[PDB]
Symmetry: D2
Subunit: 428 residues, 4 copies
Amino acid sequence: MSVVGTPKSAEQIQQEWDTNPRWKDVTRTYSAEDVVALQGSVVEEHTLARRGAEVLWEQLHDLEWVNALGALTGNMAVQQVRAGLKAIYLSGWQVAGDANLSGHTYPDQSLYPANSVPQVVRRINNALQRADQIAKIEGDTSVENWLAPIVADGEAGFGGALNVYELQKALIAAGVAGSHWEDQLASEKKCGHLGGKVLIPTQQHIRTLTSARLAADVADVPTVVIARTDAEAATLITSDVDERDQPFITGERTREGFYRTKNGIEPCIARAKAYAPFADLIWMETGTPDLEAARQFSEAVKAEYPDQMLAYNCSPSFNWKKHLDDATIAKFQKELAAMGFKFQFITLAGFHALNYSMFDLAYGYAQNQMSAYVELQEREFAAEERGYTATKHQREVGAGYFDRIATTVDPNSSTTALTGSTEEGQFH
Amino acid sequence: HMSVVGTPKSAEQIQQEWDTNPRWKDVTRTYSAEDVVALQGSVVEEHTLARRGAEVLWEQLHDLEWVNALGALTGNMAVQQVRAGLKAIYLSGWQVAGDANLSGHTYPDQSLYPANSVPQVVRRINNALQRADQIAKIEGDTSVENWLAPIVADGEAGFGGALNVYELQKALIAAGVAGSHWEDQLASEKKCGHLGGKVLIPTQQHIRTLTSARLAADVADVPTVVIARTDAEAATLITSDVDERDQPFITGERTREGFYRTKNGIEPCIARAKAYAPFADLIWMETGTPDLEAARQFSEAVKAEYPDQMLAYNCSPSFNWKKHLDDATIAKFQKELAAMGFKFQFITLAGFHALNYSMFDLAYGYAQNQMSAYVELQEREFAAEERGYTATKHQREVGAGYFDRIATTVDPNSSTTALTGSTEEGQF
Amino acid sequence: MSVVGTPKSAEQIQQEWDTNPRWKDVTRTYSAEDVVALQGSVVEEHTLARRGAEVLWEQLHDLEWVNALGALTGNMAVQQVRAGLKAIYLSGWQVAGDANLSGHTYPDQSLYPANSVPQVVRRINNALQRADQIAKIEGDTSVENWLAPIVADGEAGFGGALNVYELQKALIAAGVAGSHWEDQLASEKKCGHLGGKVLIPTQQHIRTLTSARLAADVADVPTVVIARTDAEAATLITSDVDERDQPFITGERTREGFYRTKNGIEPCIARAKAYAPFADLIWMETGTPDLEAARQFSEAVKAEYPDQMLAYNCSPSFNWKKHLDDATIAKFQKELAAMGFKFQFITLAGFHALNYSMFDLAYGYAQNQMSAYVELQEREFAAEERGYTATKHQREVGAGYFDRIATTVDPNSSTTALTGSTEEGQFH
Amino acid sequence: MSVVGTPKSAEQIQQEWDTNPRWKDVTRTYSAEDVVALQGSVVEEHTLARRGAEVLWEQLHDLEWVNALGALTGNMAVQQVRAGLKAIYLSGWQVAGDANLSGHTYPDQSLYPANSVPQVVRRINNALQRADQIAKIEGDTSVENWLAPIVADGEAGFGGALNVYELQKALIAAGVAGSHWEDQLASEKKCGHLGGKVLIPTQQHIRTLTSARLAADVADVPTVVIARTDAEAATLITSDVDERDQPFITGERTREGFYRTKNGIEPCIARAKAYAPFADLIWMETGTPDLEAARQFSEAVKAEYPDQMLAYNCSPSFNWKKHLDDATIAKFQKELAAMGFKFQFITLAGFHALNYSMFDLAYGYAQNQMSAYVELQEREFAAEERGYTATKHQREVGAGYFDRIATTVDPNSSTTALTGSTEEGQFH
Ligand SMILES: O=C(O)CC[N+](=O)[O-]
Ligand SMILES: O=C(O)CC[N+](=O)[O-]
Ligand SMILES: [Mg+2]
Ligand SMILES: [Mg+2]
Ligand SMILES: [Mg+2]
Ligand SMILES: [Mg+2]
Ligand SMILES: [Mg+2]
Ligand SMILES: [Mg+2]
Ligand SMILES: [Mg+2]
Ligand SMILES: [Mg+2]
Ligand SMILES: [Mg+2]
């Protein structure tokens, strides 16, 4: 029939694995023929997932470190990229709280439908693509790359290896660059800074990481795979079956059948070492923003895997000024970067920006009506000097871009949008 | 015997209600009570939040000096608006186009998105307010009297004909809308009222839309607030000279598409408003500037014919407010409008601007100073707590304590509850 | 503000539990006050969930037995009710294979998004409401109740007790009458007639049934709760914590940490007895359609709970003429009913009818083009004396109902649909 | 700083238009530079849309003709391909009746949300990809191309030119091979065989066809664009503005302001000639299945455009045996093919196959319970010699494929599906 999307041969895949420095430190317990066997007779190209993953991998090695903020709407990502950031973090917490396909507000317990984060990945990419389209017709060259790589939350996979596989495939279809996966029991999944966490055995999380890599391999894109461990605070594990976990099993049980396990940095290091062959970046949740604890984890892992890159959650679940002085806060990310934490992210930044800004506006509006909104509008005008463009909201969402479509189709159209608008007449 | 749940009322009951309930005092229906019953099948679904919200909205419009609101495009946004003291939520179609519609794309405000997008956001907002209400109950928080503030949502131009209007109204009601607004534009060329290129439809065709919106509410058995919007102040085009009420403004000239040129301004707005009044609970005229005198001229001309007719006013961010008004006039704007009979006033794009500006600000400072910039935000949140802000403790804000209560109701001995052991418990 | 939706008092709830015969055999390990504590300030009425649950309960005690077929589209349920069936079965298997929100074809392993079955419940209710509306304007009183009760698949809850709770809540909101829940590990869930099944402890499934009842109580509707056990074929269990499961543990462990367990009817009887206080109906998956095996199960359960109703899966996963003769097949369901199996269902009926009928049609179309389709249309014509109505496809999907809406809004509309249609012209 | 998805230059695009025979008869009223200006800086590859459209175009010139059946679920399309068909038809009618994103049953009047057909395109492709995957691991070479091209319904574009553009873009994103567009007023859209149809001016539909091509060009795929005219039966048109339409305007008006127009083959021929430069295939809706009327249309169009391919709706809205004898029915498609009708499709095949087969099954089940289902199962067994495979429903939906994923991830898994299943043991 056609040749579009013809799969590579197993030999080509193998050559890529054998010679591409992307795969230098990557262990795969399956073969290239196994990958090909699962690809059918046509492989869909995933342009944004490939481009994002390649850019992300190049950035993690060129930049001193890559940092990001949590984004839960498309407009949020656009502003993050407009303000200079070069990656986007897609928090599952934030999806649970304000952007998931159930319509409900949830705590961070894998309650929402498993295609929710992929939908937001696609949304963020759509929004960045629109900004990219608008910049082109506007001659705006101030942002080098609107298609910033997206690192998305795979939580605990929403089930078994096959649930992991499908979530990774959906993330890739939507244009993800990287995804992270934690060693928690999905049915009891928690945010890293909530209590009641239950670990799964070390080998079961290796299965998760293997499944996530397999899905990427089958989809033929070099997705960055991140392994997160929750062993610092978790005091429960599902089973003592894995000998790597037994040194921490205490013998105490729960009525659910769980096993108590000794928590802290020691089992995090062990698990991190075990995940390293399967992880492009390794991440340990911690209870406080502590540079020394971070350095201890960094050196224990790098003592065995010197080129292993790390990721660090700069969590709003910390009270920052309760633990650190301003001088430490200022240098915090820089100090982590020297330790090998090359991806650093404020997970819930979008939740807090969105809730605080609207509370502050609505509170003043309840008291002073228009005066309170004009304050915001004037702050927007004054922010144009810093590069802010969304004050002219019509062009920001593409009124001019769609006018260009309209006049490409019918140059004599008398129903274009921006001509005669208040934006053209009142905003300079 | 068959269950009697959902038994529809008799036409006599409906007619009795229309005749005696003061809610319907000034409401014309060109169809009969029997026509309504003919469309209801043999079971009528109860719409609790649509009924409650429509009832509360109507009471507030008659009890308060005026009802004001801000546009909300996420659930969390509406929660903060109600937390901050507002008593109604405005659901902007513009904002749904820009950052919250079911296509996943960023759109200008031209009816490009799928027609069930606004109903999904209505349902989302109600779900978010319900969660806030649930949390308040278990926390003993009586600081908000009514968490289920009424939602007024954008019906745009109906996404087609009378039947498309009917189905959108029905979907808004099913999601729990209190009120909905409908504008006299051609849906295939729909514009934001402050964009150019607008095309009116004939006066009688909008009466058909308003009639279809009422019919859908009657068939669904809820007293939804129906708002008529006219775009005749700026639109210089109309599809047809069919209606004799429109003909005095027709010039006779036509565009290459066959549209009729029409003389715009306050005069056709007054005429259309008078024609819409028997079919509208509120009437709203889009305007090119925020002008108290223009609003008064419109108000007096309408109330000369319909003295009890309530009005609505769009305090649009598409105006450059300090270009047109001084601070003193800005401070008194809404209060002066209320005295003229503008009982529902709303800042349409408040959510878009709060969201974009706050993330640009955060992301910009983050790009310069990393963690210092976010700590400024967290510290502002801490200080807002004396004004009633609660989202700094983000875990409880999204229901972690509510779901802990569910979990311990199911199994009081659960060892996997979330708030006990959280960093929120330990640090906030 | 308003009184619409005001919750009942705990005393009112308690009086219902104490005196409504619906609850005569129903254990609740939580209190009426616990329910009230979770309801916030407003309880949404769920008309179709309440009505359907009431009708299903009445039918189970009034009819000799209630039977159903699997339905995966709305039209499918319309034809089931048109042909005289009194209940709809909503198979999770069929949703996985051809009707879930990922858009993918899945085996029956809880791979699809957890709100998929709720959407199909809502869809089936919408389709039945449309048939009910059409019937009303057509004066068609040949079906007593178009709103037949829907029994839908809760699978293994897609996680822990909170995932169970949210799924039950979503099914209710969509209008479900009853829901079934199986004692399987969600992360390894299988169809009852697939291999590789893993049981969860008896107490864990009581937790699931408890959570399902709690969500119904909080939603204030009397949902029918069905317990399914997979212990007939499952040879694995997650844990030996529960002393009721220990008699069947062998001591062997898999590499995953699962416990090997002796499958058969004896564990199913024991689990059924344990589930009975928390289940309105009990169902054991079986490997073959066997009246004696079913009698053995029924007799042993009713020895302890004489009034316990049972449910039976007449599975297409069986090869019926391989096991049974024509005489036994003809009497199968009637015999089961005399044993207490009051709900009997053919799970994958819709998958097989849909797939076979299109293959048959398309195979002939490939060979003989239009002659193959005309054979079908003539069978449809022939079916009209048995009550089939869908040959006239325009009125079947509501063309006449929406014509009635259109002429209610505008009796003089020149754009109604059925007048001048080829249906009016060619189908007498 | 990546080259993935780099856009072509205008010169490359221009050379394609000048040298690829695909475009030899295609008029574009916009430039190649206009296309590039709208592409941003990254162009997403649409593998399935490209392959589908290339395969479709090749098939329309290689085969005697391409015929298809309407499909509304993924499994339906699988059985069509399994039975030997080489294209899929995606009916908007069927989507309105039983497969659209509102969840409601609708008549065919553009009532459903505009992203509904794109989702079904994606669903159909997903289902075919699964059949492809399964076939590969089963060594099944019985179907040469599982990814058969999909021809999908763009109705009247759901608004203006920009709504057209967005629908085409969304169809391509989902993998469509061709799309069709009709010269009706979107707000009054009807099935071609319903009454109350309203035409739009000839130039407005040229604009629609121009927008659909532009969206395909911007997405860089050779989508097949099909122009449908409803002028054979429509007696209304929105305007007299287009001199090409005026010969048929009678001067009579409707109260809405529409213009009566003389319907028949004459205006169809005239509109087809006007659409020819913009349409890869031209389709005239007709009131009866009439070979002579088809010939007149074909001959008059090809008199001016000899190479213009046509398309014909073998509609179930015709009562076939009322108009034609069996011999004419049998030769119908082959006769139309010789006249240049190279794409022929039975639009509502899936609705009638689905509805009749379930009525027939449920009627028998209502009377004879299991006996009626066993008849169907035996027919399925009997169809296996014709190539039917879905009797083994577990492997049909991919239980063997996901088993292969699972064993690729973990060869020692004790929780695979097919080992130990009743399909393995009873369906050998
Ligand atoms: O994010 C914030 O701190 C609020 C920004 N602002 O101007 O409202
Ligand atoms: O076998 C069936 O289900 C009926 C076949 N059919 O579609 O006419
Ligand atoms: Mg997370
Ligand atoms: Mg590594
Ligand atoms: Mg202030
Ligand atoms: Mg609007
Ligand atoms: Mg009025
Ligand atoms: Mg199931
Ligand atoms: Mg019981
Ligand atoms: Mg159609
Ligand atoms: Mg042509």
